[PDB]
Amino acid sequence: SGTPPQVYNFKRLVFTNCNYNLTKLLSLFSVNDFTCSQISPAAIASNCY
Amino acid sequence: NLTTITKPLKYSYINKCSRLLSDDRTEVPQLVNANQYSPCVSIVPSTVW
Numbered sequence: 001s002g003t004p005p006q007v008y009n010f011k012r013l014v015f016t017n018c019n020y021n022l023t024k025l026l027s028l029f030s031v032n033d034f035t036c037s038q039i040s041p042a043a044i045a046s047n048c049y
Numbered sequence: 050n051l052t053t054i055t056k057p058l059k060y061s062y063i064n065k066c067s068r069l070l071s072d073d074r075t076e077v078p079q080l081v082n083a084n085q086y087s088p089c090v091s092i093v094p095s096t097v098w
């Protein structure tokens with residue numbers, strides 16, 4: 001929700017000890033580009049961090 | 050002073066090669082091994098437009 005900011009004033013969300021479900025997060029989105037560095041794309045959705 | 054070999058229009062390369070799964074939600078990249086070709090050359094011709 002809300003107007004997203006520009007690239008030099010991005011808004012942060014920190015996550016520590018909470019349940020995340022990207023199957024209901026990214027279902028509201030459509031990925032145009034998906035790039036990752038040092039991990040696989042499937043590593044986030046399964047490995048506990 | 051060597052004309053027997055010719056010149057193409059431009060150079061071109063691939064910057065992304067991934068696949069969709071049956072869920073149409075997740076992208077799996079492919080890494081070509083030594084002295085073979087990724088399957089994604091089957092969809093792009095020798096000259097990228």
Ligand SMILES: *[C@@H]1O[C@H](CO)[C@@H](O)[C@H](O)[C@H]1NC(C)=O
Nearest residue numbers: 088089090091092093094095
């Ligand atoms: C293989 O044949 C299909 C049939 O039209 C074509 O779409 C595809 O580009 C061809 N692949 C190569 C590498 O020529």
